[PDB]
Amino acid sequence: HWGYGKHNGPEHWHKDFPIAKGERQSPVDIDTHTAKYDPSLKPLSVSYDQATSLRILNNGHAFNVEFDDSQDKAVLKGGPLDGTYRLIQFHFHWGSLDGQGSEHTVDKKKYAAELHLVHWNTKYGDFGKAVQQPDGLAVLGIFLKVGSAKPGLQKVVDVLDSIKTKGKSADFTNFDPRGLLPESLDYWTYPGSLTTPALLECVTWIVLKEPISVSSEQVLKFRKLNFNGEGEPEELMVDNWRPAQPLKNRQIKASF
Ligand SMILES: [Hg+2]
Numbered sequence: 001h002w003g004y005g006k007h008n009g010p011e012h013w014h015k016d017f018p019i020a021k022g023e024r025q026s027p028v029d030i031d032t033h034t035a036k037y038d039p040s041l042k043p044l045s046v047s048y049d050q051a052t053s054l055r056i057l058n059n060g061h062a063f064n065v066e067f068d069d070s071q072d073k074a075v076l077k078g079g080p081l082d083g084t085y086r087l088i089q090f091h092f093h094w095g096s097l098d099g100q101g102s103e104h105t106v107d108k109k110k111y112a113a114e115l116h117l118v119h120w121n122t123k124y125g126d127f128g129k130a131v132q133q134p135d136g137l138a139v140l141g142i143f144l145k146v147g148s149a150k151p152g153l154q155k156v157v158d159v160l161d162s163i164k165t166k167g168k169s170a171d172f173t174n175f176d177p178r179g180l181l182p183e184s185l186d187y188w189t190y191p192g193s194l195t196t197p198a199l200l201e202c203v204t205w206i207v208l209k210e211p212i213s214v215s216s217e218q219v220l221k222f223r224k225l226n227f228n229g230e231g232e233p234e235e236l237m238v239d240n241w242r243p244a245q246p247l248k249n250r251q252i253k254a255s256f
């Protein structure tokens, strides 16, 4: 199957997943001078105070932190969205070096990593249903740059040792996502897709202007994860990002 290697990387995904060369693929390059300032755009509403983290798992391509989405516990609303979207999981994409790792680019600038908080539209009842609609998902993307340590990320970092290989999971309760948000909620938004197979075109992307800073030690720890399963040859989990895709007519609107 698919990966980020020489023989199964992004350039090969189209073979199993034809939609890889569809009309609304992600990520893209955000050209700040071409983005349209839209004054009709409402402020984002992030309601994560009653979030319920359950666990963390190494799925062989990233590590997912999962949340209880059986009720409106952690939700996203406002901004470009109509209705309420529930948080289901967050994950990151990171590089082998500090100069790469992000999926979206800003004026061709690459960040060290990118945080994706994934939410599904409650009018669809379940995640599986929401991935059948063009307005099924909303992904909140936050860039990471190397500098000062992010206190709020430390809890995730310390548990990576326990889920080093593909298929390993750990109980991960009482984790507050609010510690991973930047000061400002200014954003760019555009209609896209999931950045991993099945590359479904169901996402409303909200990418935050303001990056969060994390320390070299913190991102270092991400780089120690393995794509492989226990008892298998070691393949470091690095560079698990997809290159920018053709914008193809779409328009990127700015909230600022
Ligand atoms: Hg869809």
Ligand SMILES: [Zn+2]
Residues within 6 Å of the ligand: 091, 092, 093, 116, 195
């Ligand atoms: Zn992602």
